[PDB]
Structures are given as structure tokens and as C-alpha cells.
Amino acid sequence: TINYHELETSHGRIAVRESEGEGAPLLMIHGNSSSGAIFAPQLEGEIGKKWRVIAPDLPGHGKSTDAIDPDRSYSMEGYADAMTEVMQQLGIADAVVFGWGLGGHIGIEMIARYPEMRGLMITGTPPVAREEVGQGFKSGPDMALAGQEIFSERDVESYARSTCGEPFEASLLDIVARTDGRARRIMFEKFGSGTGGNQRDIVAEAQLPIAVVNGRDEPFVELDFVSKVKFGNLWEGKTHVIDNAGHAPFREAPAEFDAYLARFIRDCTQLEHHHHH
Numbered sequence: 001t002i003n004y005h006e007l008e009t010s011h012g013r014i015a016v017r018e019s020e021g022e023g024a025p026l027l028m029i030h031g032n033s034s035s036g037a038i039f040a041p042q043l044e045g046e047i048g049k050k051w052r053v054i055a056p057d058l059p060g061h062g063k064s065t066d067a068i069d070p071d072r073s074y075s076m077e078g079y080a081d082a083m084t085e086v087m088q089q090l091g092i093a094d095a096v097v098f099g100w101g102l103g104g105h106i107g108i109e110m111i112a113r114y115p116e117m118r119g120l121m122i123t124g125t126p127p128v129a130r131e132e133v134g135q136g137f138k139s140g141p142d143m144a145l146a147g148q149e150i151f152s153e154r155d156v157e158s159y160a161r162s163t164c165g166e167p168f169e170a171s172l173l174d175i176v177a178r179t180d181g182r183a184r185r186i187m188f189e190k191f192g193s194g195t196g197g198n199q200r201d202i203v204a205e206a207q208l209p210i211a212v213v214n215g216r217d218e219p220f221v222e223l224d225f226v227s228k229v230k231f232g233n234l235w236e237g238k239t240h241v242i243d244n245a246g247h248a249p250f251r252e253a254p255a256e257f258d259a260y261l262a263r264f265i266r267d268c269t270q271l272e273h274h275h276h277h
């Protein structure tokens with residue numbers, strides 16, 4: 001019952017999946033070398049049955065084309081531009097946004113570009129200034145692949161297994177193998193070059209509700225660091241941790257993840273929130 005269609009955008013042709021839900025819209029943004037197909041549990045499950053879930057593929061990812069201009073598109077801020085253009089074409093100005101990994105960093109960059117965003121949930125994403133990368137992320141061989149252009153077959157498998165967690169499915173290899181490797185290299189370099197907004201300052205100053213939900217056994221993100229990040233309006237007043245999940249709780253522990261996501265959507269769309277400045 002998923003509505004699949006493609007949009008011609010200034011970045012290239014962007015693939016979009018939409019759930020059947022009549023309720024408030026939720027944009028879900030996938031991570032590095034993934035695709036919106038990863039959000040099957042939300043798209044096809046109870047979240048997507050109630051709310052209008054939109055899960056696009058970033059340029060260079062999934063069923064989208066490679067970027068027309070990699071130098072423009074393949075960066076946290078460039079992806080944020082692309083997603084903002086997608087939402088404009090879909091006529092949706094006030095989505096709640098969920099971002100996974102790279103997708104969470106993209107969501108942070110979207111705050112300035114998508115002013116009627118009703119909330120942002122980030123999973124697998126430490127808001128960090130460029131000089132804080134070592135504090136926010138755990139060092140390791142799979143983390144090292146995040147910025148590597150060319151993946152071998154073994155790289156594809158290792159990266160898919162670590163980023164997606166249990167259960168591994170063969171379809172994941174196809175998603176990761178497709179990714180335009182230039183996107184990994186350029187996005188990583190540009191983060192290091194400080195090309196976009198300072199994410200630490202952005203989340204500290206943002207007035208919209210920001211929710212933080214992670215798997216307890218995160219292999220990429222330093223949860224203690226994340227629990228100390230200053231947020232302007234931290235949803236439910238703390239960062240949340242789900243047992244028996246790692247980098248991808250939305251698929252590893254869907255029931256528990258969906259409880260948080262559903263409640264966040266309810267809060268962001270049913271309660272008053274004020275911008276005092």
C-alpha cells in the first residue's frame with residue numbers, strides 16, 4: 001500500500017515513498033549509503049497507517065539518480081536543500097522530521113531552511129561541531145567507511161551489518177552497493193571543512209522540539225556525549241535509550257522505537273509550542 005513516485009528536482013530525480021496515512025506528515029530521512037526503503041517498519045506499520053510518512057532517497061542513494069552536481073548536493077547542507085525542495089514540491093511545509101544518522105545531521109541543517117518544521121527527532125546522530133567529531137562518534141573500521149569512496153564487496157557487507165543491526169537482510173547489500181561513493185567522500189570532507197552551520201550551536205538555539213532516541217548498544221555514537229548536548233527544547237527533557245538495539249532501533253526494536261515516534265508526533269502536532277523570539 002506504499003505510494004512510490006519520482007520527482008524531478010534541481011538535484012536530480014528523487015524517489016519518494018509515502019504511507020497511506022491521513023494524519024499529520026512525517027518526513028523520514030535515511031542515513032549514509034542507505035535509502036528510504038530502510039523505513040519499511042514505519043511505512044508499512046502502525047505509524048504509516050495513521051500518519052503520512054514520507055521516505056525519500058537522497059541524491060546518489062537508493063532509487064534516486066546521482067546528483068546533477070555532486071559539489072552542490074553531497075553535503076549535510078546540500079541534502080537539507082534537496083529535502084526542502086522535495087517537501088516544497090509535495091506541498092508540505094509543516095512536517096515533523098525524523099533523521100537517522102547522516103539523516104539526523106541533515107534534519108539539523110533543515111531547521112533554518114524549513115521554518116515550519118513541527119519537530120525533529122534524531123537517531124544515531126550526535127550534534128557536533130567539526131572539532132568535536134571524536135567526542136561524538138566511536139572510532140572503528142565501519143565508522144572509517146563512512147567517508148570512503150570505493151567499497152569492496154566486503155566493505156558493503158560490513159557497513160550494512162553494522163549500520164543496520166539485527167536482522168541482516170540481503171536486500172541491504174543492494175542499497176549500500178548502489179550508493180554513489182563520491183557522496184561519502186565529499187560529505188565527509190565538507191563536514192570537516194566546516195561548510196555548513198555549527199550543529200552544536202544550532203540545536204542549542206533551536207526553539208522547536210528536538211527528540212533524541214538511540215539504541216543502548218550504539219556502535220557509532222557516544223551516548224554519554226549525546227546525553228550532555230545542550231538542546232533549546234529537548235523533548236521530554238532527556239535523551240532516550242532503547243535496550244537491545246544499536247544504530248537502527250527503528251528496525252531492530254520497532255515496537256519500542258515506534259512508541260517514542262508516535263508520542264513525539266502527537267506532542268508536536270497536538271500541543272502548543274511557542275517561539276518566544
Ligand SMILES: CCCCCC(=O)N[C@H]1CCOC1=O
Nearest residue numbers: 031032101102146163188191
Ligand atoms: C563526518 C561525521 C559522520 C557523518 C554522518 C554519518 O555518516 N553517519 C553515518 C554513521 C552510520 O550511519 C550514518 O548515516
